[PDB]
């Protein structure tokens, strides 16, 4: 289950202000490679990772025409939703869209995805069989019947089984130097005295890729889950990620605490002390 | 690359 490709659309109506804003973003695994914003001077699908820049002008044109046209689609879908739910044309609303493929280490499809949201809540979702839909409510139920009759699933299944898989394989090959070489975390432990009796030990994981990581504290080799303060994994800004884990420990007793780091880029799980 | 629908996913 090594890899994935993902596209995310956000369509935000803003009555009073201009036409609804449309933003699209594309990812391979935890790397953003592509970007579109209907608010820009001249809206274009634009690169966000070194390895996509090598696609020629017709890739960029085709992707741009798609996004402009997808904008129109969701711009209209906002108005339909407005009617299905009987909402004021003065209110601002948001449609979100997700789709993409998962592949195993072999490059073969594991599953595809296509989900839509309205104002932050599930709306309709393609089932894992890529043949049927699950509506979240009675408004989405009308869509399901429209999409069933228009056989909208057929094209999605074709994309996800085919083009999604093949372009992802292409991208993983072109970007192999960065996409397929896991960067292990740089780890250190810091000491912060909070009184005479107690200090915080903070275990740091820095500059790692991909985002998935496990940090745990042990005392005398036994787990310390209830007592561990974990922060959410956060972007460094340079396409890598950071996380830390902390535990409050009595003075002098620091050597009994060990931090444990698991990440796909480490040959073996780390064990760290202060 | 992005999905390019033949048939609009119209609500």
């Amino acid at each position, epitope marked *: 289950g090594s890899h994935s490709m993902r596209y995310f659309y956000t369509a935000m109506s803003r009555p009073g202000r201009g036409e609804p804003r449309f933003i699209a973003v594309g990812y391979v695994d935890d790397t953003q490679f592509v970007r579109f914003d209907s608010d820009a001077a001249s809206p274009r699908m634009a690169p966000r990772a070194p390895w996509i820049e090598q696609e020629g002008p*017709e890739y960029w044109d*085709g992707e741009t025409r*798609n996004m402009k*046209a997808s904008a*129109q689609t969701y711009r*209209e879908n906002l108005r339909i939703a407005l009617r299905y739910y009987n909402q004021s044309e003065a209110g601002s609303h948001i449609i979100q869209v997700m789709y993409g493929c998962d592949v195993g280490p072999d490059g073969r499809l594991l599953r595809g995805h296509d989900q839509y949201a309205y104002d932050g809540k599930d709306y309709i979702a393609l089932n894992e069989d890529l043949s049927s839909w699950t509506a979240a409510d009675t408004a989405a139920q009308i869509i399901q019947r429209k999409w069933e*009759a*228009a*056989r909208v699933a*057929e*094209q999605l299944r*074709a*994309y996800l*089984e*085919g*083009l999604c898989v093949e372009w992802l394989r292409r991208y993983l090959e072109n970007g192999k130097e960065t996409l397929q070489r896991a960067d292990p975390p740089k780890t250190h432990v810091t000491h912060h005295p909070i009184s005479d009796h107690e200090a915080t030990l903070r275990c740091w994981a820095l500059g790692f890729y991909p985002a998935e990581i496990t940090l745990t504290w042990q005392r005398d080799g036994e787990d310390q889950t209830q007592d561990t303060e974990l922060v959410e994994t956060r972007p460094a800004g340079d396409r890598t990620f950071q996380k830390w884990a902390a535990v409050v420990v009595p003075s002098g007793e620091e050597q009994r605490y060990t931090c444990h780091v698991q990440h796909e880029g480490l040959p073996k799980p780390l064990t760290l002390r202060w | 690359k992005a999905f*390019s*629908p*033949e*048939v*609009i996913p*119209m609500f």
Partner: T-cell receptor, first 109, second 109 residues
């Protein structure tokens, strides 16, 4: 986009006819065949996604060679009523389709 | 599903004429094409939804409107020095196009 098909084509009734099409663009992921009686409208016969090697419906078989950007339509056991103009068409999406010029098929009884 | 009437139309050079196209299929998108010998199908105008019309590839001298669903009337002005063609009205709901049976316009000197 540029789609080319033979003007061509005359077969004996009962034989099998094949009509050919090529297109130039890799973005053409939706591929179609239509037929038209002269003086009337196009009628949709088949569609296929670039995903698929082949598709079959009764007497009709469509093969696609994505590598060769080559689309073909096979009509099994042609009849008199099969005589018509056949159009392949291709789209990259949004029904922004390019039609070929059409292949006139004559079925000799 | 789609009806175009009348089947034939005749007009003197330099005179406006509106062609009729009606549908009972409840499709959102409708299209106008022309067909000429030694040429396939050239788009003129299209409408993905009521109150919205976009120029096709060859709109020089054409105008359309969409005020209701159901209907998409094309108007031919003193457009080109060649408004004589076969005109086909079309709509989309699912993969591919549904076509009307077409109208022949002959414009004479």
């Amino acid at each position: 986009e540029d789609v080319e098909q033979s003007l061509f084509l005359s077969v004996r009734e009962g034989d099998s006819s094949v009509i050919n099409c090529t297109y130039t663009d890799s973005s053409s992921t939706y591929l179609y065949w239509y037929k038209q009686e002269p003086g009337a409208g196009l009628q949709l016969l088949t569609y296929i996604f670039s995903n698929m090697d082949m598709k079959q419906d009764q007497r009709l078989t469509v093969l696609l060679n994505k590598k060769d950007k080559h689309l073909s339509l096979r009509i099994a056991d042609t009849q008199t009523g099969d005589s018509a103009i056949y159009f392949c068409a291709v789209s990259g999406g949004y029904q922004k389709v390019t039609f070929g010029i059409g292949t006139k098929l004559q079925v000799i009884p | 599903g789609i009806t175009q009437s009348p089947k034939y139309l005749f007009r003197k050079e330099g005179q406006n004429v509106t062609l009729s196209c009606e549908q009972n299929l409840n499709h959102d998108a409708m299209y106008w094409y022309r067909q000429d010998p030694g040429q396939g199908l050239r788009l003129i105008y299209y409408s993905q939804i009521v109150n919205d019309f976009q120029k096709g590839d060859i709109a020089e001298g054409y105008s359309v409107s969409r005020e209701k669903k159901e209907s998409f009337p094309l108007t031919v002005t003193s457009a080109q020095k060649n408004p004589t063609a076969f005109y086909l009205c079309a709509s989309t709901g699912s993969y591919g196009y549904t076509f009307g049976s077409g109208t022949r316009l002959t414009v004479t000197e």
